[PDB]
């Protein structure tokens, strides 16, 4: 996976889990693994869910626990684009990087929220880069609208 999973994200993983468990019997259905997806917040292909049902069905015959369900839902929950997650919610991750509640994002709220993410320390260049990246409005801060970019493709 890109990153380690947070906790309210396993709480997600969690509920789908809980959702595809109780509707499993033998073989997970298309309709039903679509909505179990969308119960952590993501939104599937029909080509990934034929891939997705094939492999439960096929490849693990229908045999998944929690830690294979993590494994197969992880990449697609961190893959969630602005668009899956809601304005309620982008709002809300964007609040958590900016602490001081100023409405902006600092080279050190930046620096600390990516540490928290990682799981290690970023260097001050790699954030001073990131900066530049994804500041459009030269002001040196992050805003809401160039948060939300940063997660959209
Ligand atoms: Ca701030
Ligand atoms: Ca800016």
């Given at each position: 996976?890109?990153?380690?999973?947070?906790?309210?994200?396993?709480?997600?993983?969690?509920?789908?889990?809980?959702?595809?468990?109780?509707?499993?019997?033998?073989?997970?259905?298309?309709?039903?693994?679509?909505?179990?997806?969308?119960?952590?917040?993501?939104?599937?292909?029909?080509?990934?869910?034929?891939?997705?049902?094939?492999?439960?069905?096929?490849?693990?015959?229908?045999?998944?626990?929690?830690?294979?369900?993590?494994?197969?839902?992880?990449?697609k929950?961190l893959?969630?684009?602005?668009?899956?997650?809601?304005?309620?919610?982008?709002?809300?991750?964007?609040?958590?990087?900016?602490?001081?509640?100023?409405?902006?994002?600092?080279?050190?709220?930046?620096?600390?929220?990516?540490?928290?993410?990682?799981?290690?320390?970023?260097?001050?260049?790699?954030?001073?880069?990131?900066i530049?990246?994804?500041?459009?409005?030269?002001?040196?801060?992050?805003?809401f609208?160039?948060?939300?970019?940063?997660?959209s493709?």
């Amino acid at each position: 996976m890109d990153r380690s999973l947070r906790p309210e994200e396993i709480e997600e993983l969690r509920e789908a889990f809980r959702e595809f468990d109780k509707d499993k019997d033998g073989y997970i259905n298309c309709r039903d693994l679509g909505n179990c997806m969308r119960t952590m917040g993501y939104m599937p292909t029909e080509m990934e869910l034929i891939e997705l049902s094939q492999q439960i069905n096929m490849n693990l015959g229908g045999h998944v626990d929690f830690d294979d369900f993590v494994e197969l839902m992880g990449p697609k929950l961190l893959a969630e684009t602005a668009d899956m997650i809601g304005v309620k919610e982008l709002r809300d991750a964007f609040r958590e990087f900016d602490t001081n509640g100023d409405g902006e994002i600092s080279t050190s709220e930046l620096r600390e929220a990516m540490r928290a993410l990682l799981g290690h320390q970023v260097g001050h260049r790699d954030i001073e880069e990131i900066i530049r990246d994804v500041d459009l409005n030269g002001d040196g801060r992050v805003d809401f609208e160039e948060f939300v970019r940063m997660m959209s493709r």
